[PDB]
Amino acid sequence: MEIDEGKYECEACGYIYEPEKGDKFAGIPPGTPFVDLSDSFMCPACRSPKNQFKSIKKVIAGFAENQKYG
Ligand SMILES: [Zn+2]
């Protein structure tokens, strides 16, 4: 829907790694971008290899628009 804060999504299970928040569930603190994870980080939900994670900085959403932007 709307992401960009270095939020990565596991294409293997659908988990979302939070960099600024850190993988508190895996052991990684916040203030850390996914690109800085360990050389072999595993998903805390599906245990997949960090290489299975993929960023997602895109915003898609639009169901109603009764206006013309000014
Ligand atoms: Zn996963």
PDB file of N, CA and C and ligand atoms in Angstrom:
ATOM      1  N   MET A   1       0.853  -1.223   0.000  1.00  0.00           N
ATOM      2  CA  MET A   1       0.000   0.000   0.000  1.00  0.00           C
ATOM      3  C   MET A   1       0.876   1.256   0.000  1.00  0.00           C
ATOM      4  N   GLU A   2       1.408   1.619   1.134  1.00  0.00           N
ATOM      5  CA  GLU A   2       2.270   2.833   1.198  1.00  0.00           C
ATOM      6  C   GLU A   2       3.522   2.547   2.033  1.00  0.00           C
ATOM      7  N   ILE A   3       4.642   2.343   1.395  1.00  0.00           N
ATOM      8  CA  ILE A   3       5.891   2.054   2.161  1.00  0.00           C
ATOM      9  C   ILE A   3       7.072   2.818   1.558  1.00  0.00           C
ATOM     10  N   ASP A   4       8.172   2.888   2.268  1.00  0.00           N
ATOM     11  CA  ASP A   4       9.377   3.623   1.747  1.00  0.00           C
ATOM     12  C   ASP A   4      10.482   3.694   2.811  1.00  0.00           C
ATOM     13  N   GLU A   5      10.131   3.611   4.066  1.00  0.00           N
ATOM     14  CA  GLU A   5      11.168   3.688   5.139  1.00  0.00           C
ATOM     15  C   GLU A   5      12.046   2.432   5.137  1.00  0.00           C
ATOM     16  N   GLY A   6      12.742   2.185   4.058  1.00  0.00           N
ATOM     17  CA  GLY A   6      13.623   0.981   3.987  1.00  0.00           C
ATOM     18  C   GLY A   6      12.858  -0.263   4.447  1.00  0.00           C
ATOM     19  N   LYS A   7      11.558  -0.257   4.332  1.00  0.00           N
ATOM     20  CA  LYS A   7      10.775  -1.453   4.759  1.00  0.00           C
ATOM     21  C   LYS A   7      10.909  -2.559   3.711  1.00  0.00           C
ATOM     22  N   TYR A   8      11.474  -3.676   4.077  1.00  0.00           N
ATOM     23  CA  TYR A   8      11.634  -4.784   3.092  1.00  0.00           C
ATOM     24  C   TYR A   8      10.540  -5.833   3.306  1.00  0.00           C
ATOM     25  N   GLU A   9      10.098  -6.466   2.255  1.00  0.00           N
ATOM     26  CA  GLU A   9       9.031  -7.498   2.402  1.00  0.00           C
ATOM     27  C   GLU A   9       9.555  -8.868   1.960  1.00  0.00           C
ATOM     28  N   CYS A  10       9.404  -9.865   2.788  1.00  0.00           N
ATOM     29  CA  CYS A  10       9.892 -11.224   2.415  1.00  0.00           C
ATOM     30  C   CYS A  10       9.028 -11.805   1.299  1.00  0.00           C
ATOM     31  N   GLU A  11       9.573 -11.963   0.129  1.00  0.00           N
ATOM     32  CA  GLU A  11       8.769 -12.553  -0.977  1.00  0.00           C
ATOM     33  C   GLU A  11       8.483 -14.029  -0.673  1.00  0.00           C
ATOM     34  N   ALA A  12       9.144 -14.579   0.315  1.00  0.00           N
ATOM     35  CA  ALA A  12       8.931 -16.013   0.654  1.00  0.00           C
ATOM     36  C   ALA A  12       7.732 -16.205   1.593  1.00  0.00           C
ATOM     37  N   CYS A  13       7.539 -15.339   2.559  1.00  0.00           N
ATOM     38  CA  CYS A  13       6.387 -15.541   3.490  1.00  0.00           C
ATOM     39  C   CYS A  13       5.484 -14.298   3.557  1.00  0.00           C
ATOM     40  N   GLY A  14       6.040 -13.127   3.428  1.00  0.00           N
ATOM     41  CA  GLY A  14       5.196 -11.896   3.485  1.00  0.00           C
ATOM     42  C   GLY A  14       5.535 -11.091   4.743  1.00  0.00           C
ATOM     43  N   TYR A  15       6.697 -11.301   5.295  1.00  0.00           N
ATOM     44  CA  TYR A  15       7.097 -10.548   6.515  1.00  0.00           C
ATOM     45  C   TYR A  15       7.655  -9.183   6.115  1.00  0.00           C
ATOM     46  N   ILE A  16       7.609  -8.228   7.000  1.00  0.00           N
ATOM     47  CA  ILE A  16       8.136  -6.877   6.656  1.00  0.00           C
ATOM     48  C   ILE A  16       9.266  -6.488   7.617  1.00  0.00           C
ATOM     49  N   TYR A  17      10.477  -6.446   7.134  1.00  0.00           N
ATOM     50  CA  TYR A  17      11.615  -6.060   8.014  1.00  0.00           C
ATOM     51  C   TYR A  17      11.599  -4.545   8.242  1.00  0.00           C
ATOM     52  N   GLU A  18      11.616  -4.125   9.475  1.00  0.00           N
ATOM     53  CA  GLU A  18      11.612  -2.665   9.764  1.00  0.00           C
ATOM     54  C   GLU A  18      13.026  -2.210  10.147  1.00  0.00           C
ATOM     55  N   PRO A  19      13.638  -1.430   9.288  1.00  0.00           N
ATOM     56  CA  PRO A  19      15.011  -0.939   9.564  1.00  0.00           C
ATOM     57  C   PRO A  19      15.011   0.056  10.724  1.00  0.00           C
ATOM     58  N   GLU A  20      14.469   1.217  10.512  1.00  0.00           N
ATOM     59  CA  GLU A  20      14.426   2.245  11.595  1.00  0.00           C
ATOM     60  C   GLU A  20      13.930   1.624  12.908  1.00  0.00           C
ATOM     61  N   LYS A  21      13.159   0.573  12.824  1.00  0.00           N
ATOM     62  CA  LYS A  21      12.647  -0.077  14.064  1.00  0.00           C
ATOM     63  C   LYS A  21      13.577  -1.218  14.485  1.00  0.00           C
ATOM     64  N   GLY A  22      14.166  -1.893  13.539  1.00  0.00           N
ATOM     65  CA  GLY A  22      15.090  -3.008  13.885  1.00  0.00           C
ATOM     66  C   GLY A  22      14.310  -4.316  14.005  1.00  0.00           C
ATOM     67  N   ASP A  23      14.981  -5.422  13.845  1.00  0.00           N
ATOM     68  CA  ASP A  23      14.299  -6.740  13.955  1.00  0.00           C
ATOM     69  C   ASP A  23      14.239  -7.172  15.419  1.00  0.00           C
ATOM     70  N   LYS A  24      13.584  -6.402  16.243  1.00  0.00           N
ATOM     71  CA  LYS A  24      13.483  -6.756  17.692  1.00  0.00           C
ATOM     72  C   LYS A  24      13.111  -8.233  17.865  1.00  0.00           C
ATOM     73  N   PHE A  25      12.441  -8.802  16.901  1.00  0.00           N
ATOM     74  CA  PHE A  25      12.055 -10.237  17.008  1.00  0.00           C
ATOM     75  C   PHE A  25      13.239 -11.132  16.627  1.00  0.00           C
ATOM     76  N   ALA A  26      14.144 -10.630  15.829  1.00  0.00           N
ATOM     77  CA  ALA A  26      15.321 -11.454  15.426  1.00  0.00           C
ATOM     78  C   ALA A  26      16.530 -11.111  16.302  1.00  0.00           C
ATOM     79  N   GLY A  27      16.617  -9.893  16.763  1.00  0.00           N
ATOM     80  CA  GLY A  27      17.768  -9.504  17.628  1.00  0.00           C
ATOM     81  C   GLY A  27      18.455  -8.247  17.077  1.00  0.00           C
ATOM     82  N   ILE A  28      17.929  -7.657  16.035  1.00  0.00           N
ATOM     83  CA  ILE A  28      18.572  -6.432  15.476  1.00  0.00           C
ATOM     84  C   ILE A  28      17.857  -5.173  15.996  1.00  0.00           C
ATOM     85  N   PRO A  29      18.624  -4.242  16.520  1.00  0.00           N
ATOM     86  CA  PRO A  29      18.035  -2.988  17.055  1.00  0.00           C
ATOM     87  C   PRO A  29      17.599  -2.067  15.910  1.00  0.00           C
ATOM     88  N   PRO A  30      16.937  -0.990  16.262  1.00  0.00           N
ATOM     89  CA  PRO A  30      16.460  -0.024  15.239  1.00  0.00           C
ATOM     90  C   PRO A  30      17.642   0.736  14.639  1.00  0.00           C
ATOM     91  N   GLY A  31      17.374   1.830  13.985  1.00  0.00           N
ATOM     92  CA  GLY A  31      18.475   2.629  13.370  1.00  0.00           C
ATOM     93  C   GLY A  31      19.378   1.716  12.534  1.00  0.00           C
ATOM     94  N   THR A  32      18.804   0.794  11.811  1.00  0.00           N
ATOM     95  CA  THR A  32      19.634  -0.124  10.979  1.00  0.00           C
ATOM     96  C   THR A  32      18.878  -0.512   9.700  1.00  0.00           C
ATOM     97  N   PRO A  33      19.405  -0.108   8.569  1.00  0.00           N
ATOM     98  CA  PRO A  33      18.753  -0.432   7.275  1.00  0.00           C
ATOM     99  C   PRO A  33      18.917  -1.918   6.946  1.00  0.00           C
ATOM    100  N   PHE A  34      17.990  -2.476   6.216  1.00  0.00           N
ATOM    101  CA  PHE A  34      18.089  -3.922   5.859  1.00  0.00           C
ATOM    102  C   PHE A  34      19.436  -4.206   5.185  1.00  0.00           C
ATOM    103  N   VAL A  35      19.955  -3.257   4.459  1.00  0.00           N
ATOM    104  CA  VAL A  35      21.261  -3.471   3.774  1.00  0.00           C
ATOM    105  C   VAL A  35      22.380  -3.685   4.800  1.00  0.00           C
ATOM    106  N   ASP A  36      22.128  -3.392   6.049  1.00  0.00           N
ATOM    107  CA  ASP A  36      23.186  -3.575   7.082  1.00  0.00           C
ATOM    108  C   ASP A  36      22.940  -4.850   7.903  1.00  0.00           C
ATOM    109  N   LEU A  37      21.944  -5.627   7.559  1.00  0.00           N
ATOM    110  CA  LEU A  37      21.679  -6.875   8.336  1.00  0.00           C
ATOM    111  C   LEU A  37      22.929  -7.760   8.350  1.00  0.00           C
ATOM    112  N   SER A  38      22.866  -8.884   9.009  1.00  0.00           N
ATOM    113  CA  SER A  38      24.054  -9.786   9.060  1.00  0.00           C
ATOM    114  C   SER A  38      24.312 -10.404   7.683  1.00  0.00           C
ATOM    115  N   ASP A  39      25.471 -10.969   7.483  1.00  0.00           N
ATOM    116  CA  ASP A  39      25.781 -11.588   6.162  1.00  0.00           C
ATOM    117  C   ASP A  39      24.842 -12.767   5.896  1.00  0.00           C
ATOM    118  N   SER A  40      24.255 -13.315   6.924  1.00  0.00           N
ATOM    119  CA  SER A  40      23.330 -14.468   6.724  1.00  0.00           C
ATOM    120  C   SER A  40      22.099 -14.326   7.624  1.00  0.00           C
ATOM    121  N   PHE A  41      21.408 -13.222   7.533  1.00  0.00           N
ATOM    122  CA  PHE A  41      20.197 -13.028   8.380  1.00  0.00           C
ATOM    123  C   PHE A  41      19.071 -13.952   7.898  1.00  0.00           C
ATOM    124  N   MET A  42      18.323 -14.516   8.809  1.00  0.00           N
ATOM    125  CA  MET A  42      17.205 -15.417   8.404  1.00  0.00           C
ATOM    126  C   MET A  42      15.872 -14.813   8.848  1.00  0.00           C
ATOM    127  N   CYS A  43      14.846 -14.977   8.063  1.00  0.00           N
ATOM    128  CA  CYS A  43      13.521 -14.408   8.438  1.00  0.00           C
ATOM    129  C   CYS A  43      13.041 -14.999   9.770  1.00  0.00           C
ATOM    130  N   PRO A  44      12.589 -14.142  10.653  1.00  0.00           N
ATOM    131  CA  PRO A  44      12.086 -14.613  11.964  1.00  0.00           C
ATOM    132  C   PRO A  44      10.703 -15.260  11.803  1.00  0.00           C
ATOM    133  N   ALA A  45      10.104 -15.143  10.644  1.00  0.00           N
ATOM    134  CA  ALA A  45       8.756 -15.747  10.439  1.00  0.00           C
ATOM    135  C   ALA A  45       8.852 -17.002   9.567  1.00  0.00           C
ATOM    136  N   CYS A  46       9.671 -16.977   8.553  1.00  0.00           N
ATOM    137  CA  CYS A  46       9.789 -18.181   7.678  1.00  0.00           C
ATOM    138  C   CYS A  46      11.250 -18.685   7.620  1.00  0.00           C
ATOM    139  N   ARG A  47      12.131 -18.090   8.388  1.00  0.00           N
ATOM    140  CA  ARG A  47      13.560 -18.550   8.423  1.00  0.00           C
ATOM    141  C   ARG A  47      14.230 -18.517   7.042  1.00  0.00           C
ATOM    142  N   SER A  48      13.690 -17.798   6.098  1.00  0.00           N
ATOM    143  CA  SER A  48      14.344 -17.747   4.756  1.00  0.00           C
ATOM    144  C   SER A  48      15.627 -16.911   4.838  1.00  0.00           C
ATOM    145  N   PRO A  49      16.471 -17.054   3.846  1.00  0.00           N
ATOM    146  CA  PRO A  49      17.744 -16.294   3.826  1.00  0.00           C
ATOM    147  C   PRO A  49      17.471 -14.811   3.569  1.00  0.00           C
ATOM    148  N   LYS A  50      18.224 -13.942   4.184  1.00  0.00           N
ATOM    149  CA  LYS A  50      18.005 -12.480   3.978  1.00  0.00           C
ATOM    150  C   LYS A  50      17.935 -12.153   2.486  1.00  0.00           C
ATOM    151  N   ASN A  51      18.528 -12.965   1.657  1.00  0.00           N
ATOM    152  CA  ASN A  51      18.470 -12.691   0.195  1.00  0.00           C
ATOM    153  C   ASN A  51      17.030 -12.832  -0.307  1.00  0.00           C
ATOM    154  N   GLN A  52      16.168 -13.419   0.480  1.00  0.00           N
ATOM    155  CA  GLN A  52      14.751 -13.566   0.047  1.00  0.00           C
ATOM    156  C   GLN A  52      13.970 -12.283   0.362  1.00  0.00           C
ATOM    157  N   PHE A  53      14.586 -11.340   1.032  1.00  0.00           N
ATOM    158  CA  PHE A  53      13.866 -10.076   1.359  1.00  0.00           C
ATOM    159  C   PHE A  53      13.963  -9.092   0.190  1.00  0.00           C
ATOM    160  N   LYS A  54      12.968  -8.264   0.019  1.00  0.00           N
ATOM    161  CA  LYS A  54      13.002  -7.275  -1.097  1.00  0.00           C
ATOM    162  C   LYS A  54      12.405  -5.945  -0.632  1.00  0.00           C
ATOM    163  N   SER A  55      13.069  -4.855  -0.906  1.00  0.00           N
ATOM    164  CA  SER A  55      12.540  -3.532  -0.466  1.00  0.00           C
ATOM    165  C   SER A  55      11.188  -3.244  -1.112  1.00  0.00           C
ATOM    166  N   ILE A  56      10.557  -2.188  -0.692  1.00  0.00           N
ATOM    167  CA  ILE A  56       9.234  -1.819  -1.273  1.00  0.00           C
ATOM    168  C   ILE A  56       8.945  -0.342  -1.002  1.00  0.00           C
ATOM    169  N   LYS A  57       9.554   0.535  -1.751  1.00  0.00           N
ATOM    170  CA  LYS A  57       9.320   1.991  -1.539  1.00  0.00           C
ATOM    171  C   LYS A  57       8.334   2.519  -2.581  1.00  0.00           C
ATOM    172  N   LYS A  58       7.115   2.064  -2.526  1.00  0.00           N
ATOM    173  CA  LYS A  58       6.097   2.531  -3.511  1.00  0.00           C
ATOM    174  C   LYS A  58       4.766   2.802  -2.805  1.00  0.00           C
ATOM    175  N   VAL A  59       3.965   3.682  -3.343  1.00  0.00           N
ATOM    176  CA  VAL A  59       2.655   3.988  -2.700  1.00  0.00           C
ATOM    177  C   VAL A  59       1.517   3.798  -3.705  1.00  0.00           C
ATOM    178  N   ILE A  60       0.673   2.826  -3.487  1.00  0.00           N
ATOM    179  CA  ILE A  60      -0.456   2.593  -4.433  1.00  0.00           C
ATOM    180  C   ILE A  60      -1.788   2.578  -3.677  1.00  0.00           C
ATOM    181  N   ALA A  61      -2.684   3.461  -4.025  1.00  0.00           N
ATOM    182  CA  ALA A  61      -4.005   3.504  -3.334  1.00  0.00           C
ATOM    183  C   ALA A  61      -4.902   4.558  -3.989  1.00  0.00           C
ATOM    184  N   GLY A  62      -6.092   4.186  -4.377  1.00  0.00           N
ATOM    185  CA  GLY A  62      -7.003   5.173  -5.024  1.00  0.00           C
ATOM    186  C   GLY A  62      -8.354   4.516  -5.313  1.00  0.00           C
ATOM    187  N   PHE A  63      -9.356   4.832  -4.538  1.00  0.00           N
ATOM    188  CA  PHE A  63     -10.698   4.226  -4.772  1.00  0.00           C
ATOM    189  C   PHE A  63     -11.728   5.315  -5.089  1.00  0.00           C
ATOM    190  N   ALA A  64     -11.515   6.510  -4.606  1.00  0.00           N
ATOM    191  CA  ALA A  64     -12.485   7.608  -4.884  1.00  0.00           C
ATOM    192  C   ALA A  64     -11.743   8.929  -5.109  1.00  0.00           C
ATOM    193  N   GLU A  65     -12.248   9.760  -5.982  1.00  0.00           N
ATOM    194  CA  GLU A  65     -11.574  11.065  -6.250  1.00  0.00           C
ATOM    195  C   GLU A  65     -12.591  12.089  -6.761  1.00  0.00           C
ATOM    196  N   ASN A  66     -13.361  12.669  -5.882  1.00  0.00           N
ATOM    197  CA  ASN A  66     -14.371  13.674  -6.326  1.00  0.00           C
ATOM    198  C   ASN A  66     -13.768  15.082  -6.309  1.00  0.00           C
ATOM    199  N   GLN A  67     -12.649  15.270  -6.955  1.00  0.00           N
ATOM    200  CA  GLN A  67     -12.018  16.623  -6.971  1.00  0.00           C
ATOM    201  C   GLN A  67     -11.088  16.762  -8.181  1.00  0.00           C
ATOM    202  N   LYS A  68     -10.421  17.878  -8.303  1.00  0.00           N
ATOM    203  CA  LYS A  68      -9.497  18.074  -9.458  1.00  0.00           C
ATOM    204  C   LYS A  68      -8.166  18.659  -8.977  1.00  0.00           C
ATOM    205  N   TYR A  69      -7.772  18.350  -7.773  1.00  0.00           N
ATOM    206  CA  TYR A  69      -6.485  18.888  -7.245  1.00  0.00           C
ATOM    207  C   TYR A  69      -6.455  20.414  -7.374  1.00  0.00           C
ATOM    208  N   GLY A  70      -7.272  21.097  -6.620  1.00  0.00           N
ATOM    209  CA  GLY A  70      -7.290  22.586  -6.698  1.00  0.00           C
ATOM    210  C   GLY A  70      -8.039  23.024  -7.957  1.00  0.00           C
TER     211      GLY A  70
HETATM  212 ZN    ZN B   1       9.992 -14.697   5.473  1.00  0.00          ZN
END
